[PDB]
């Protein structure tokens, strides 16, 4: 089947490059403007009962908006808030701002609206020393995106007031700071990537055109990637995190494909088969290797679709689309370009030994394959060494803890938390709804109050059981349905909540009313439980698909079993070492980050990407080995020539992703640096260890019994004809 495709691609010749370049540039120009519309409420699981409870609560009572913006204010020049003339300036300034933005801001809430007050809540608005006071600036909106987009436009006008002596914090400043750090990362990305990719391409080739071509190929492939993700975003919203990383990862991995192309054609010119059919061969081998890589990557990324995480689904869509488009379009354009330009690659040059290294590599391989036990025991000890960290795991949620302490916004947030205690809380929501729809009797409310009170472990500020479980006050933006009601109260320790939430789920309300449990801890617990339940089945389906496609590619079962165990080993190893190195040593101080319980969808996608990359290196090695076996030489000759012919190519492929991972770790956000550490350490250490020692030593044991296969295991191999 590949012969026909190769014949068509080298008969199409010239005009195809022009039409494809025109199409991809048009798509890129159309897709430049896709970052305007993004979503930020997509990390919540929609199938959980807690989110449904929250939706019913905000439908009946209206969404709360006092926690979006909190402003710490302090009078300067050693003057307290007692002076009556001081607050006049602040009130006039904020009144002018809200007048300028009456549609954009409705008003303000704080201590200044009524100095004389008897409310226990408003008296606490003012501190003991009469120095710092916090005010609340509500923002309107049906959901979060309009809230945030009206927030940044008033960000500077609200910040400048009182001569720049106000400290703003809340949920919206955090989102604005993530937008700012993504913007600076985008500014840094290309300008830091181009010199490093240029120098590594100069190192591996040293030819100006052979290095300039992949740079253009990556740029044209990413344009199509963003175009395809825009088309798929037209139906389903896409979270911001899909823009800065995934595409470039595509770019990163895409380079590898192009690298191999622009590599092997070169060595073909060392041989000698002519410009016309140079493509002939190179296209066949490039096509087979890229289709194997593409199908295995998409098969590794597809099992995550079963997860109901919308953000994770968007990431999987983006990565699958980028890999597919990069593979197909890049192989087409490079094949046609090498057909057109011909063998004159080494014409311009910079003006516009190696045998000893090969012998050393052969000696290293011989030493490796001579003694397999003294390095087999290190495998077991490092297995234990990676299992030991696995006990130390903690999972949490998204908060301000991610942001580095250097940013002034977290400094303001932590100052507010430290000096002003107890104002920010995340109480659980216990929803009562009636099937009939009749108004809820106060007797039933008291009964449910008692049933929720009978269990301990809750926080009571003024030490009387009666006033606990206070009803949610009704905001003026919700329709008060008497058939549905909610109550809430705070908690002391986040960890014990799963028990308290579980017990609240356990209790039996009266027959007439039915109960929802919700809140910020309930959604986290539901997500953790769901992923813990669906992890083994996802791993099983992933491993069976991987091994069945490995069998479909070339054959044999011992090699796929070794590959499966190898992938399990590497995914355990990288996770264990990345969770250990930060804990045992004070390595967090150098990169300036703090401990925090990791959240699970991201580590799942990291497992997916390390799976893909390690297994892609494995299938590259296996494909070259089976090519050598089809040549007809012995196993030792095949192993040595396989190491010799592509050690430099594998090293360059590893260096590309090491360079991009460095480019990411120069960023500021901690979670991104965490995933960059994971992928970098995995690729570098594990790939070096497997290529240098593990693979040659382990592939020497079985022998001829490895290639043996049942009759129906070979009939399907000869029938398909794809390989």
Q: Which residues are annotated as a binding site?
A: 40-44, 616
Non-local CB neighbours of 539 within 8 Å, separated by 6+ positions: none
Strand 429-434 with 470-471, pairing: unpaired
- Torsion, Cα of 219, 225, 226, 230 (10° steps): 160
Q: Any idea which residue has 């990359």 for tokens?
A: 613
User: 604 with 531: CB under 8 angstroms?
Assistant: yes
* Neighbouring-strand partners of residue 168: 71
Torsion sign across C-alpha atoms 378, 381, 387, 389: negative
C-alpha–C-alpha distance, residues 1 and 365, integer Å = 37
Q: Any idea which residue has 């609206």 for tokens?
A: 113
144-159 and 86-100 are packed helices; what angle lies between their axes, rounded to 10 degrees?
140
Q: Any idea which residue has 């402003």 for tokens?
A: 71
Closest CA to 509 of 458, 456, 435: 435
Closest CA to 303 of 69, 484, 503, 549: 549
* SS3 call for 239: strand
The residue count for the chain: 723
CB burial class (10 A; 0-12, 13-18, 19+) of residue 392?
A: exposed
Structure tokens at 267: 């060595």
User: 614 with 340: CB under 8 angstroms?
Assistant: no
Summarize the annotated binding site for SQ109 as residue ranges: 616
Structure tokens at 52: 């449904």
C-alpha–C-alpha distance, residues 322 and 363, integer Å = 40
Structure tokens at 98: 């809200």
C-alpha–C-alpha distance, residues 167 and 189, integer Å = 31
* SS3 call for 430: strand
Closest CA to 492 of 415, 425, 402, 397: 425
Q: Count other Cβ atoms within 10 Å, centred on residue 92.
A: 10
User: 299 with 293: CB under 8 angstroms?
Assistant: no
484-488, strands of its sheet edge to edge:
470-471, 484-488, 429-434, 513-518
Half-sphere exposure for 586 (CA within 13 Å, toward CB): 1
Non-local CB neighbours of 91 within 8 Å, separated by 6+ positions: 112
Closest CA to 699 of 634, 610, 609: 634
Structure tokens at 576: 């264990």
User: 667 with 181: CB under 8 angstroms?
Assistant: yes
């Amino acid at each position: 089947m590949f012969a026909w495709w190769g014949r068509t691609v080298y008969q199409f010749r010239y005009i195809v490059i022009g039409v494809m370049v025109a199409l991809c540039l048009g798509g890129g120009v159309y897709g430049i403007s896709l970052g305007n519309h993004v979503t930020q409420s997509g990390f919540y699981d929609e199938g959980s009962q807690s989110v449904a409870a929250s939706l019913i609560g905000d439908e009946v009572y209206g969404r709360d908006r006092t926690s979006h913006v909190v402003a710490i204010l302090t009078p300067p020049d050693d003057k307290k808030v007692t002076d009556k003339a001081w607050q006049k300036k602040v009130t006039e300034e904020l009144d002018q701002v809200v007048k300028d933005h009456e549609d954009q801001i409705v008003g303000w809430v704080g201590w200044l609206k009524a100095p004389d007050t008897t409310d226990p809540t408003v008296s606490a608005m003012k501190t003991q020393d009469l120095r710092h006071t916090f005010i609340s600036i509500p923002l309107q909106g049906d959901d979060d995106d309009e809230i945030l987009k009206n927030y940044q436009v008033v960000e500077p006008e609200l910040q400048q007031v009182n001569g720049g002596d106000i400290r703003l914090a809340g949920l919206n400043p955090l989102a604005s700071e993530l937008t700012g750090t993504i913007g600076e990362d985008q500014k840094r990305a290309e300008v830091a990537a181009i010199p490093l990719v240029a120098v590594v391409l100069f190192f591996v080739f040293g030819t100006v055109i052979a290095a300039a071509l992949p740079a253009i190929i990556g740029g044209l492939a990413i344009a199509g990637a963003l175009g395809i993700m825009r088309l798929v975003a037209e139906f389903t919203p896409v979270h911001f995190f899909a823009q800065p990383v995934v595409t470039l990862i595509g770019l990163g991995i895409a380079i590898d494909y192009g690298l191999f192309i622009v590599s092997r054609f070169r060595e073909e010119i060392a041989e000698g088969y002519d410009t016309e059919a140079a493509v002939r061969r190179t296209v066949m081998t490039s096509g087979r290797t890229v289709v194997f890589s593409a199908v295995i990557i998409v098969a590794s990324s597809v099992p995550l679709l079963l997860f109901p995480q919308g953000f994770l689904k968007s990431i999987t869509y983006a990565i699958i689309a980028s890999v597919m488009l990069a593979a197909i379009l890049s192989i087409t354009v490079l094949a046609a370009a090498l057909a057109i330009l011909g063998p004159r690659v080494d014409a311009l040059g910079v003006t516009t030994r190696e045998e000893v290294e090969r012998g050393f590599w052969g000696r290293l391989v011989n030493v490796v394959m001579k003694r397999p036990i003294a390095f087999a025991a290190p495998i077991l000890v490092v297995m234990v060494l990676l299992i030991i960290p696995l006990g130390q795991l903690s999972l949490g949620g998204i908060s301000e803890k991610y942001l580095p302490p250097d940013n002034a916004v977290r400094q303001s947030q932590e100052q507010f938390d430290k000096l002003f205690p107890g104002f920010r809380t995340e109480p659980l929501t216990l929803v009562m709804k009636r099937e009939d729809g009749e108004p809820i009797t106060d007797a039933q409310i008291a009964d449910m109050r008692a049933k929720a009170l009978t269990v301990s472990g809750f926080t009571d500020p003024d030490n009387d059981p009666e006033k606990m479980w206070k009803e949610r006050p009704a905001n003026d933006s919700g329709s008060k349905d008497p058939s549905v009601r909610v109550i809430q109260n705070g908690l002391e320790n986040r960890n014990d909540a799963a028990k308290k939430i579980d017990e609240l789920r356990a209790l039996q309300p009266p027959h007439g009313i039915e109960v929802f449990v919700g809140g910020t801890p309930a959604l986290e617990q539901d997500s953790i439980h769901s992923l813990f339940d669906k992890l083994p089945l996802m791993a099983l389906i992933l491993i069976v698909t991987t091994t069945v496609l490995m069998f479909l590619a070339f054959g044999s079962v011992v090699l796929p079993i070794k590959a499966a165990l190898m992938s399990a080993l590497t995914l355990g190893s990288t996770m264990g070492i990345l969770t250990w190195m930060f804990v045992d040593g004070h390595g967090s101080g150098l990169m300036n980050y703090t401990p925090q319980p990791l959240m699970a969808p991201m580590i799942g996608l990291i497992i997916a990407v390390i799976w893909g990359l390690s297994t892609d290196y494995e299938v590259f090695l296996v494909s070259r080995m089976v090519e050598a076996r089809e040549r007809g030489m012995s196993t030792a000759e095949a192993i040595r020539i396989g190491t010799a012919t592509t050690g430099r190519l594998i090293t360059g492929a590893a260096l590309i992703l090491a360079v991009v991972a460095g480019a990411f770790v120069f960023s500021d956000l901690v979670m991104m640096k965490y995933l960059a550490f994971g992928l970098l350490i995995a690729l570098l250490l594990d790939a070096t260890i497997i290529r240098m020692f593990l693979v040659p030593a382990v592939m020497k044991l079985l022998g001829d019994d490895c290639w043996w296969a049942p009759r129906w295991m070979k009939r399907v191999q000869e029938k398909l004809g794809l390989g």
